[PDB]
Each structure stands twice: as C-alpha cells, then as structure tokens.
C-alpha cells in the first residue's frame, strides 16, 4: 500500500489490526505536550504495530499517531490473514498465544 504525504498510517485511539513494514519512505510517530511533534522517525526496513496481530477483536487500540513523511510504501499483514494462516500451524499458534499472555502479564 502506498501512502500519500502526511497521511495517517495509525491514528491514536483507532483499532489496530495490522503490521506494517516500511518498504520505502519514512513515517513519524507524532507525540508531545502540544501534539503533532515528531518523536521518532522510522526509515525503510522498520516494522511497527506487530503487537496488534495477537490481540482479540477490539483488543488493540493504537496509542500514538503515525504519519507518513512523503510518499511511503508499506507492506501490510492483516490480523485476519494471520489468523487464517495460523490454523495450519497449531504449534506456532500456541507459541504466539503464550507470547501474547507473557506480553500482557509483563507489561501490566
């Protein structure tokens, strides 16, 4: 998927259901007291939002605004696609569920 400049890849409080891989371009994680202030700029080869794939329906909400800086080409893996893949790999499914529990327990 190609994003136009200043497009919102992720919006704060929106549903997170995808994992993005930056093939080209940059994205900016906007945050601050004022807001809309660049905190970190992710160049090509970066992967962000991967934790939203392990969440249940409605489980994950985006916590910061991610804005494309220029024309950004991203590779996206939807949660539905991962769920459709995982039915053929019960061992990896169990491993990912265990990792989800560990992520939930350790962060809280």
């Amino acid at each position: 998927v190609v994003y136009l400049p200043n497009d919102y890849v992720c919006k704060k409080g929106e549903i997170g259901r995808e994992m993005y891989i930056i093939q080209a371009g940059q994205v900016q994680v906007l945050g601050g007291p004022d807001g809309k202030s660049v905190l970190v700029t992710l160049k090509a080869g970066s992967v962000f939002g991967e934790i939203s794939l392990l969440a249940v329906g409605g489980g994950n909400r985006r916590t910061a605004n991610v804005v494309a800086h220029g024309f950004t080409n991203l590779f996206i893996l939807d949660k539905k696609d991962l769920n459709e893949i995982l039915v053929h790999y019960p061992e990896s499914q169990k491993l990912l569920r265990k990792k989800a529990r560990r992520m939930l327990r350790s962060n809280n």
């Binding site: 549903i15 371009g25 329906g57 409605g58 220029g70």
Partner: protein, 512 residues
C-alpha cells in the same frame, strides 16, 4: 532558495516556454540555411529571435539545476544534491553543447541548438497527460511531426537542387535567374508541394534524370512508406481505443441475446433484458463500481465511500451512536444495486438478510396487488435494518413484512447480514448496542418475545464427541495442579501443627 517541482504546475508552464525556441530552431534553421532569400530578407527578424532563443536556452540550464526529484518519497531541495544529479547525466552534455557559442551570423553555425530537443518532446508528453482531449492532441501532435518532416524534406530538395544547379535538368528546381521562378514565395511553396507529393506517395513526382537524383527520390519513397505506415498504425490504434468501450458492451448484449434465443426465454422477459441494456448505455452505467475502484488503496476507497454513504448511513436508527471506526467499515461493505421499474425489492413472506439504502429513485410500499401503495420511500431512506441484526428472539423470523416495489429505475446500496457480522468482529461493544436497539424497536412493534424454550442444535455426533474428549484432557492437568498447590500446603501444614503439638506436649510434663 527556490526549487522547482516536476509534478508541480509551474514546471509545466516552463516546459511551454522552452519548447517554443526548440520548435523554432528545428523549423527555421534548416529553412534559413537552404533558402538564402529567407536569411538575407529577414535578417533583422532572425537577429532578435536568435537572441531570445539563446536566453531561454541558458535559463533552462539554470532551471535544470533547480528541479527537485523524489528520493524516498520526499522532494530533494538540497543545492548540491540537485547539481550532482544533473551534471553527471548525458542531458547536461547535450544542453551545454546546445548553447555553446559560435566563435559567422550564418544559420549553419547555429545547428548545435538543434540538440536539447528533449525539452520539446517532454512538453508534448506532458501536455497529453494534462489535456482533457487526449486523442485530439495526439492527432495534432502527429500532424505536426508530419509537417516538420515535410518541411525538412522540402529544404533538402532545394539544397540538392542548388548543389546540382538550378535548371540544369527537369528534376531539380527551375532557374533562379528566371523571374518566373526566382522569388522566395514560389521556391518554398513549390518545394513544400514537391516534398508533400513525394513523401505521401499519392501523386506523381517529375522523373529523376541522374543517378544521384534517383537515390534521393528512392530515399523519400522509403521514408514516406515508414511515415505512412506509422500514421495508419497510430490513427488505427486510436480508433480501436475509442470504440473499445462500445465494442465490449455490444459483445455483452450479443452474448446475452444468443442465450435467450438458445434457452427460449419468453418475449416478455426478453424485452425486459433488452430494455435494461439500453438504460445502461444511455445513462453510462455499464461499468461496475466494484471493478472501477478495486485498484485504489483501502484508505482512498474509504475516503470516497464516506462522501457518498456516510450522510445517509448515520440517519439509520440502529447506527445512531455507532463509533466512527465502525461507520467506515460499514460504508465499505455497501454494494450497489439497480432495479428496473416495477421490480420488487422484497416481497411479504420472503427471507430477508439485507438492508437497503436508496441512493436514487423512488420505492413504494405496496399491497398484495401492486397498484395500491401504503407509503413512499424516497432517496436517503433505508429499510430492512432489523433483518441484518441477529436478535436472539424475533417473531419476524428474518422474513419481510412489507412489499417494496420500484416506481422507476432506483439505485440501492445493500448491507447484508454477513457483512454486518464481519464489520462488528472488531467492535464487540458496538454489536451489543446494535442488538439492544433492534430489540427495543422489536418491542414497540410487538414482535420480540419468542423462542424462550426453543433452541436448535446442529453439532455433529463426532464434533460433540470431541468436547467429551477435550474435557477429559483438561481435568487431568487440574488433578495434578489442584493437588500440587494443596499438597505443598498440606506438606507445610503437617510441620507447623506438629511443632506446636510437641512444644505444648512438653508443657504437660512441667504441669505434673
């Protein structure tokens, strides 16, 4: 500092400014070199025009140093990066060689300006994508190429005639000293006529006399064959492109018309299908909406679908308090539907699993006899909202309770039961609110309470056996787990009571 954007509008306005001197140099330099009367007669005009062209040629060099380029999706505005991107290219070499100073006023020393022609081809390429009329420009651009070749060939014929000698034989241009032939209006117009007559291969040119003259006419005929075949190929490919929409539509009607005569479709239904295809062509609704926007990304597709359906979808009672994220999911699920006049959207007693929103057209709630109408549904109205909700108990049983008929052609957008279920997988709280609102509406109608003790079970005997196997494996882990927490406490329990037992038992020895 100022940096130009190639996609920008101002860059295209410069492209017209530079292409005019380039086109002037390609047309007038060959003519002034070959037709000496043109050069001497209008020497002051060429003196001004040559300076103006050279100023633009130098300016284009400075512009080329200040056009940005996209690097990682960002326009580059760094002065050193723009200079290094342009200088090492081949185009810098042609552009410098184009504007190299001549160190005579003759037009022949200015032939280096014929280089850097790429700015002229770029303008034509840029104009074609920008113009609303792409075929009119493509013909006009093609005709201009013919005129430049014909004009160039006209000047070569006059130059060859000068080299051989004017009037030495019948093939060359006649004697200049003769006042009947020796003036600039006659010699250009006849040579233009000769070049057109020879390149187009239509009329008959005067026969050549010498072997050098035979070669030039053979070359023109060979060149004119390639030009004419390219003309027919370009125009013939344009005509195929303009007709392609109608040609593929006529194939669909012909394919359907073959099926109706093959399967003996009744004439009442056959004329209904024919009348439908005339509506599609007349109102230009032949292409499907889903096929049009399938290439667009989901963000751009959602942005378009918000502007079409979000105003009407928020008027639906159940979607009153829906979240902004869910509403974007719903408007992407809507599917267009077109109904002929008198068509039944839904009938009483028919299973209903869709909700329809009227984009355009008038629908009428009608009785069992179609003519009598209870109510009228205009554009923006919705019906069937409760059918897509899976209420636990409904006296309706997802069956339509009204007959809806279209008075004329109506455009409907349908949200199905499955599409609503898919949208609310990620919005579980909203699903609960939608069902509660539908339950409240069903109370007001009086059609809610049903199936209190009625439940349907379709689990397979092998699948129901699976839960019995599954429940057994879960309990055995608990049997170890319940005891391990308890026995460790029980192992802890025995020592702590015993030490209190033994110490108090020793007290009894002190008692007596």
């Amino acid at each position: 500092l100022f940096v130009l954007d190639p996609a920008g509008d101002w860059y295209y306005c410069w492209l017209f400014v530079i292409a005019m001197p380039v086109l002037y140099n390609w047309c007038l330099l060959v003519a002034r070199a070959c037709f000496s009367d043109l050069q001497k007669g209008y020497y002051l005009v060429w003196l001004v025009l040559d300076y103006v062209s050279d100023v633009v040629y130098i300016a284009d060099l400075f512009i080329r140093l200040r056009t940005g380029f996209l690097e990682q999706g960002l326009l580059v505005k760094d002065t050193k990066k723009l200079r290094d991107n342009y200088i090492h290219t081949l185009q810098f070499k042609l552009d410098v060689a184009s504007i190299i100073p001549t160190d005579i006023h003759s037009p022949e020393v200015r032939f280096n300006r014929l280089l850097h022609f790429a700015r002229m081809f770029e303008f034509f390429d840029r104009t074609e994508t920008r113009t609303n009329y792409p075929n009119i420009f493509r013909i006009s651009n093609l005709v201009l190429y013919i005129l430049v070749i014909i004009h160039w060939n006209a000047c070569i014929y006059y130059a060859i005639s000068k080299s051989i000698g004017f009037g030495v034989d019948t093939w060359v241009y006649p004697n200049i000293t003769d006042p009947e032939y020796g003036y600039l209006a006659r010699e250009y117009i006849y040579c233009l006529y000769w070049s057109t007559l020879t390149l187009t291969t239509i009329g008959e040119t005067p026969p050549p006399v010498k072997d050098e003259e035979y070669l030039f006419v053979i070359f023109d005929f060979l060149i004119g064959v390639l030009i004419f075949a390219t003309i027919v190929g370009n125009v013939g490919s344009m005509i195929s492109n303009m007709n392609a929409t109608r040609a593929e539509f006529q194939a669909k009607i012909d394919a359907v018309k073959h099926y109706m005569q093959f399967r003996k479709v009744s004439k009442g239904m056959e004329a209904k299908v024919i009348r439908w295809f005339d509506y599609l062509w007349t109102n230009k609704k032949t292409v499907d909406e889903r096929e049009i926007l399938k290439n667009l990304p989901a963000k751009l597709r959602a942005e378009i679908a918000i502007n079409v359906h979000l105003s009407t979808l928020k008027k639906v009672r159940i979607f009153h308090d829906c979240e902004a994220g869910l509403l974007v999911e719903l408007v992407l699920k809507l599917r267009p539907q077109v109904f002929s006049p008198g068509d039944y959207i839904c009938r009483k007693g028919d299973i209903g699993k869709e909700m329809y929103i009227i984009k355009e057209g008038k629908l009428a709630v009608v009785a069992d006899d179609g003519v009598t109408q209870y109510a009228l549904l205009s554009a923006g109205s919705c019906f069937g909202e409760i059918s897509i909700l899976n209420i636990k108990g409904s006296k309706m049983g997802n069956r339509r309770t009204a007959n809806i008929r279209s008075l004329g052609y109506s455009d409907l957008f349908c949200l199905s039961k499955d599409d609503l279920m898919e949208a609310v997988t990620e919005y579980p709280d909203a699903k609960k609110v939608l069902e509660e609102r539908g339950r409240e509406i069903l109370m007001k109608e009086g059609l809610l309470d049903e199936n209190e003790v009625a439940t349907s079970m379709e689990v397979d005997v092998q699948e129901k056996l699976g839960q019995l196997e599954t429940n057994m494996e879960t309990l055995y882990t608990r049997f170890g787990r319940l005891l391990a927490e308890y026995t460790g406490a029980q192992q802890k329990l025995k020592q702590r009571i015993t030490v209190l037992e033994t110490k108090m038992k020793q007290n009894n020895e002190d008692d007596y």
